[PDB]
Amino acid sequence: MSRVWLTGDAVVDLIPDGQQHYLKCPGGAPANVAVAIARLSGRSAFFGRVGNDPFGRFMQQTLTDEQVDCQHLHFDPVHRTSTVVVDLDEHGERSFTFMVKPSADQFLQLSDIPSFQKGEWLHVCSIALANQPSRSSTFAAIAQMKEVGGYVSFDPNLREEVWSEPQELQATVMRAVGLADVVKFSEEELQFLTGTQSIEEGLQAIADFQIPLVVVTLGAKGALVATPNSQQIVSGKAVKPIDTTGAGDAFVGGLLYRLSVAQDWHNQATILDAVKWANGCGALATTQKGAMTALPNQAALYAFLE
């Protein structure tokens, strides 16, 4: 069972629950992925910075509770933990307002990067690339994982408002796309990043990247899986979402859990099965408010997939 490293932003998502209240929900895409993997009995570890504040300590506690290795989660001395307000009438990027800019995670330093080993995974989202020093630190982490013979997963997970220089987003994100073994886009993100109007055109636009595995999520319709000379839609049972927050991260968690335990993750059968798990995780994640709340264990996932 290969270790999956997650890095980036652990955040508190404030999610409406009644007209005058927010639920205090643990979140942050790479933290969500870490917990998704752990819930499936995988080996996940998180490195990054939160703030020395109650929200940062709450995220440390959450990762601890969830059996995610968080020895390399540090408290920044000055900056605050990311705090995000969710609007449930919107979906994805449009649903979030980032109250802390730049939050502690944006100050990831080179010395925060842990030792990597051959065969490990590193998963990254674009918020880690939004501002310096995290951007350069995260690119260094990617280069180090590649050098040691590990694998790199990237989910742009675009949140434009976090970028102090939003005009840098497209190029910076595409630089990371070019480094990854696995890239997951939503349909909308693929089109945005490539300036195209369809998935077909978006996939053609990234062909010269020779990305080993691209997955494009299609909401209730599942996911398009693109590997060399092959495209295939993989879909499971559609559900009516209660909260879509983090469904994409649950998806990545199932995907990477299955790739991480595979003898040879490049194998087409392994990939398609991993995407079946991913779709089931994404569906189940939507059944409760909070990105992490309904991240399934294997008993729940197997029951749903049957």
Ligand X SMILES: Nc1ncnc2c1ncn2[C@@H]1O[C@H](COP(=O)(O)OP(=O)(O)O)[C@@H](O)[C@H]1O
Ligand Y SMILES: OC[C@H]1O[C@](O)(CO)[C@@H](O)[C@@H]1O
Question: By the 8 A CB rule, do 294 and 245 touch?
Answer: no
Question: By the 8 A CB rule, do 262 and 242 touch?
Answer: no
Contacts of 5 (CB under 8 A, 6+ apart): 44, 45, 46, 47, 114, 116, 120, 121, 122, 123, 145
| Tokens (6 digits) for 4 | 């999956």
**Rounded Cα gap, residues 263 and 267, in angstroms:** 9
- Find which of ligand X, ligand Y, its own copies, none residue 84 binds, CB within 5 to 8 Å per kind: ligand Y
Q: How far is the CB of 147 from ligand BEF (least distance, A)?
A: 29
- Find which of ligand X, its own copies, ligand Y, none residue 9 binds, CB within 5 to 8 Å per kind: ligand Y
**Rounded Cα gap, residues 50 and 76, in angstroms:** 6
Helices 169-177 and 134-148, packing angle to 10 deg: 10
Q: Where along the sequence are the contacts to its own copies (CB under 8 A)?
A: 14, 17-18, 20-24, 53-55, 80-81, 83, 85, 87, 97-101
Site stretch for ligand Y (CB under 6 A), options 54-62, 207-215, 242-250, 258-266: 242-250
- Find which of its own copies, Na ion, ligand Y, none residue 5 binds, CB within 5 to 8 Å per kind: none
- Find which of Ca ion, Na ion, its own copies, none residue 14 binds, CB within 5 to 8 Å per kind: its own copies
245 or 260, CB closer to ligand X? 245
Q: Measured at the alpha carbon of residue 63, what is the angle toward residues 25 and 112, in degrees to the nearest 5?
A: 115
129 or 261, CB closer to Ca ion? 129
Q: How far is the CB of 159 from its own copies (least distance, A)?
A: 14
Question: By the 8 A CB rule, do 15 and 289 touch?
Answer: yes
246 binds ligand BEF (CB under 6 A): yes
Choose which of 28, 56, 102, 248 interacts with ligand BEF (CB under 6 A).
248
AA identity, residue 258:
R
Q: Measured at the alpha carbon of residue 6, what is the angle toward residues 250 and 66, in degrees to the nearest 5?
A: 65
Question: By the 8 A CB rule, do 15 and 23 touch?
Answer: yes
51 binds Ca ion (CB under 5 A): no
Choose which of 245, 260, 279, 286 interacts with ligand BEF (CB under 6 A).
245
248 binds ligand Y (CB under 6 A): yes
Q: What is the three-class DSSP state of 121?
A: strand
Q: Interface mask (CB under 5 A) for Na ion, residues 266-285, using x and -?
A: -------------------x
Q: How far is the CB of 94 from ligand Y (least distance, A)?
A: 11
Choose which of 36, 199, 294, 301 interacts with Na ion (CB under 5 A).
294
CA-based nearest residue to 32, from 71, 66, 3: 66
Classify residue 4 as exposed, middle or buried by CB count within 10 Å of its CB (0-12, 13-18, 19+): buried
Choose which of 26, 248, 253, 282 interacts with Ca ion (CB under 5 A).
248
Q: Is residue 249 flagged as an active site residue?
A: yes
Q: How far is the CB of 34 from ligand Y (least distance, A)?
A: 12
29 or 284, CB closer to ligand BEF? 29
Choose which of 183, 249, 254, 256 interacts with ligand Y (CB under 6 A).
249
Instruction: Write out the binding residues for ligand X, residues 82-121 only, by CB under 6 A.
Output: 92
Catalytically active residues are: 249
